[PDB]
């Protein structure tokens, strides 16, 4: 069986070129879902990094529309060509981040949202984003 690169398949969470997970827990995929089968909570790493505390997707309701993947602004969640096993209890069809978080970057290999964002994390400082200038202090001498 051959499946198109097209996402339809089994939702999956990916990681950026680094080791860190892509998701930033903004809830843009949880609200765009027609069915309402995504439910997460944002937690904050020590320095500044947003990440999902728990991520949970009800696969007994998911219709695999692909609206979630289309809404995610950080390319964290994607639809990959593979089907879920048909579980026995229906309770075991609720995936909880541990199951979903893949080891790789998925379809888009080099995109790093936090290289674009303007807020500081451990990696990048205030003036180290993409197309950004070093912060000029108001107490400067230059006019």
């Amino acid at each position: 069986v051959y499946l198109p690169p097209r996402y339809r398949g089994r939702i999956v969470l990916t990681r950026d070129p680094d080791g860190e997970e892509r998701c930033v827990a903004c809830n843009l995929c949880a609200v765009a879902c027609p069915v309402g089968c995504i439910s997460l909570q944002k937690a904050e790493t020590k320095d500044g990094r947003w990440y999902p505390e728990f991520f949970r997707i009800n696969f007994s309701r998911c219709i695999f529309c692909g609206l979630c993947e289309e809404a995610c602004p950080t390319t964290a969640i994607q639809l990959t060509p593979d089907f879920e096993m048909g579980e026995y209890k229906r309770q075991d069809l609720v995936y909880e981040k541990e199951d979903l978080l893949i080891s790789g970057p998925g379809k888009y290999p080099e995109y790093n949202f936090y290289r674009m964002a303007g807020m500081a994390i451990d990696g990048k400082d205030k003036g180290e984003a993409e197309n950004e200038a070093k912060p000029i202090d108001v107490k400067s001498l230059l006019p």
């Binding site: 069915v35 096993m85 026995y88």
Partner: protein
């Protein structure tokens, strides 16, 4: 190794697995009613009107009976959390094997038959899916 499925597919799930037998062992080689059935396959949306029909077709078949709930509409409601749809076949029928998708591929039904017959005679499948580095980009064919 003897199952004669009575496919109760209502909605687009039915016409999606219209060729379910293709991936079958005993059927399609002779040697069709719920009165002599062993396996019921609920595939389409479970409406508040078809529910008595489904329940009576369940009580007509005899006790060594296993029901498979295909699709995301039979499992739990669906995208249709609406006033006229029962929110899952398991609300009134004890399901044995669930299958996700909208609609699921015939491979899913084949694998469901195998997985159910293995009950008589993610955690177990997580390592493979969890750790895949890269995928084919959506730009070719």
């Amino acid at each position: 190794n003897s199952i004669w499925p009575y496919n109760f597919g209502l909605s687009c799930c039915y016409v999606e697995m219209v060729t379910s037998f293709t991936a079958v062992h005993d059927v399609a080689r002779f040697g069709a009613s719920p009165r002599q059935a062993d396996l019921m396959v609920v595939a389409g949306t479970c409406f508040t009107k078809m529910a008595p029909v489904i329940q009576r077709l369940y009580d007509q078949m005899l006790e060594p009976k296993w029901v498979i709930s295909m699709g995301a509409c039979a499992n739990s409601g669906g995208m249709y959390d609406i006033y006229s749809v029962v929110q899952g076949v398991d609300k009134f029928i004890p399901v044995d094997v669930y299958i996700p998708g909208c609609p699921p591929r015939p491979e899913a039904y084949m694998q469901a038959l195998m997985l159910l017959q293995e009950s008589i005679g993610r955690e177990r499948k997580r390592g493979e899916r969890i750790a895949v580095t890269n995928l084919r980009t959506p730009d070719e064919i």
